[PDB]
Every structure is written in C-alpha cells, then in structure tokens.
Amino acid sequence: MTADLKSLAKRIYEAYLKNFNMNKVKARVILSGSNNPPFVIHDMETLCMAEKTLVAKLVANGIQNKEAEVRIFHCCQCTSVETVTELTEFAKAIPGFANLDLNDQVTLLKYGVYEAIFAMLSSVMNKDGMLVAYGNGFITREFLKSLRKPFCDIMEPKFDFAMKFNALELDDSDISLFVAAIICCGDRPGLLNVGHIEKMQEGIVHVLRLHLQSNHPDDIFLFPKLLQKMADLRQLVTEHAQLVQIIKKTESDAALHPLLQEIYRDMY
Ligand SMILES: CCCCCCCCCCCCCCSCC(=O)O
Numbered sequence: 001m002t003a004d005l006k007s008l009a010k011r012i013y014e015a016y017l018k019n020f021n022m023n024k025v026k027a028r029v030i031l032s033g034s035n036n037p038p039f040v041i042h043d044m045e046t047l048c049m050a051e052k053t054l055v056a057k058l059v060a061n062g063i064q065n066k067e068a069e070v071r072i073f074h075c076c077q078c079t080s081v082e083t084v085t086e087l088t089e090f091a092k093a094i095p096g097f098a099n100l101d102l103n104d105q106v107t108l109l110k111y112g113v114y115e116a117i118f119a120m121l122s123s124v125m126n127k128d129g130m131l132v133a134y135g136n137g138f139i140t141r142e143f144l145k146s147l148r149k150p151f152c153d154i155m156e157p158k159f160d161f162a163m164k165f166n167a168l169e170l171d172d173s174d175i176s177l178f179v180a181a182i183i184c185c186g187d188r189p190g191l192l193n194v195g196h197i198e199k200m201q202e203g204i205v206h207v208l209r210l211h212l213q214s215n216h217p218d219d220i221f222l223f224p225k226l227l228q229k230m231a232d233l234r235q236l237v238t239e240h241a242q243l244v245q246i247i248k249k250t251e252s253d254a255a256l257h258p259l260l261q262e263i264y265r266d267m268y
Contacts, residue, residue, distance in 0.1 A: 003203075008095065009177060009211045012204075015093030016176030019086050021134060024123040024172050030135050031126060038131060041139040044068060054133045069151035070253045072144075076154065077257045079132070083120070084113050084259065087183070094180045096200035100193060107190050108197070110263055112183040114240065115233040119178060122162035130155075150246055161236055165229060168222065174215060177208040178226055182233070238268045 017023055030038055039050045047068060051059045055075060059065050066074070088109055091097045097105065124131040129140040144155045170178070184205075186198035212222045219225075241264055247254050256264075 005207050005210050006214075008207050009173065012093055012180050012207070013173045013176045015090055016172060016179065019090040020120070021082070021086065022120070022124060022131070024170075024175065026135065027124045027131055030131060031124075031138075036136060038136055038138040041132075041137055042129075042143050047072070047139075047143070050133075050137050054136055066253050069147045070251065072147065073151055073154070073247070073254050075132070077260055080114075080117060081257055081259055083117050084109075084263070087113050087116055087179070090179070091183050094184060094200070095203055096196065097183070100196065100200075104192050104197065107188055108183055108185070111188040111267065112185065113263060114237040115182045115230070116179045118158055118161060118233055118236055118240075119165065119182065119229070120175065121158055122165040123175065125159055125162040125166070127159075127163060130159075150243060150250070153243060154240075157236060157239065161232065168219070168225060171215070174208075174212060177204065177211055178229075180204050181208050181226075182230060185230075241268055 039046070039053065041047050041050045048059070051071065055071075058071055058074065065071070091105070091109065097108075100108075121130070124135075127141070129138050129143075131137065132139050141155070141159055145152050181201070181204050184197065184201040186194050186201050188197075191197055208226070209223050212219075212226070216222045244256070244264060248256055
C-alpha cells in the first residue's frame, strides 16, 4: 500500500521513448557511423547541398531565399516547435500534471520547454557538432561558430553546457526523469496552484533521486549535480531569450514562429 516509485520511473522512461523522436541510444547509433546516414554540414557549400535535400521548400525561392544564417535560425525554430509538441504530450505521463488547471499546465510548459530542450540537445551533441533534421544531418560546431554575428552566438553556450552534461554519462532512463523534474517547478512565475505543483515536484524529484541512487551507484553526488544543472539551464534559457530578443529587434528577416513568440512573451 505504498507508491511504487520504480514502476513510476519506468512509466516516465517509456513515455519519453514514445514521445521524443530522438533519444540518446538512437543518437549514438547515428553518431557512431548504413541507410540514410547523416549529411555532414561543415561549410556553406555543404549547408546548401543539405538544404536542397532536407528542407527543399526553404531554398526554392531563387534570389528571394533568405540569408544562410536566417535559414539556419528558421530551422532552429522549427526544431524547437517540434520539441515543444513532444514535451507537451510527454508531460501527460507525469503524475498530477494532467490534474492541474489548464492554465497552470500552460505556465509550467512555457517556462520548462527551453530548459528541457537544451538538456535533451546534449544527447545529439558531441565536441565536434550536432545531429539535426531528424538525425539526417550533422552540423559542425565550427561551422556554427563561423556564422555572422549574432547567429554564431546561439549554439556555442549550448555545446558548452552539453559537454559537461554528457560527462555525467546519464542514460535515457535518467534523462526522462530529469526532464519531468524540469517541467515540475513550483516557482515558475504566475502559477495558480503552487501548493499542488510543489507536491507534484516533490514526488517526481523523489523518483529521480531514488532512480539515480540505483542506476548510478558510483556517483554519490549525482542528484545534487543535476539540481545544479537545472539552475544552470534556467540561466542558459534567460540568456538565450535575451539573444533571441536582439535578433528580433535587429534582424528583420528572422521571423519568429508565433508559438515561440508566445513562449518568450513575459518570460524573463
Ligand atoms: C539544413 C539543416 C540546418 C539545421 C540548422 C541547425 C538546427 C539546430 C537545432 C537546435 C535548435 C536550438 C533551438 C534554439 S534557437 C531557436 C529557438 O529559440 O527556438
């Protein structure tokens, strides 16, 4: 007559495998090097080749095509929009989330999605580049740094986060619970039922703590390491939103998708 925390951890893991198109095992298989291998984007020639195959509509406009950096930023946004959709369905697996008022579900997703995006991005990153386009491209870290300002400033802080996050050697069973804990933060601005959310947070963090104790017996400070990573992600998102606002004010061609504009509105 007790909560079965091991079963809850497995439920969360299975919901993560079901709802995210990319998982760390899938990513590692691709990154390791037989059908539809990723096209390597390391310079402008290879960017433009990859676009013609993978996002043909975006480059079908002739001299009306947007600048390379703006096309890349558009693809960044499309990736976020898709991951927002996956996170919204995943959150239904978190005990108590679907019982919250709709407005509180919206608030938790509003503040949590980018922290979750950057945590999970680590799974497709290595020190040399990252998988993109549903695992069909590999874009190099050096190519992204070569873009004109301000677009070269988007990804590098995310690689820096990811290299340290990946050194923790989490697997999908850990990351799924970490993402659920990100979503269940009771201190988000504007929440109505803080008390119930705090209890939901306490429950999922308890599951996470017990799971890490079992799955990582070698790293006795893994749970507090991950609490700190959650705080680091909040700062990474605040900084990312500031850069996006610079782009919005100064780059007239870099249209911001309406779903992401709403996420950013009144965020920080
Ligand atoms: C041809 C393929 C080119 C692909 C270009 C790279 C795609 C990067 C995906 C990660 C996006 C990071 C999202 C943060 S930037 C946009 C946002 O704020 O949502």
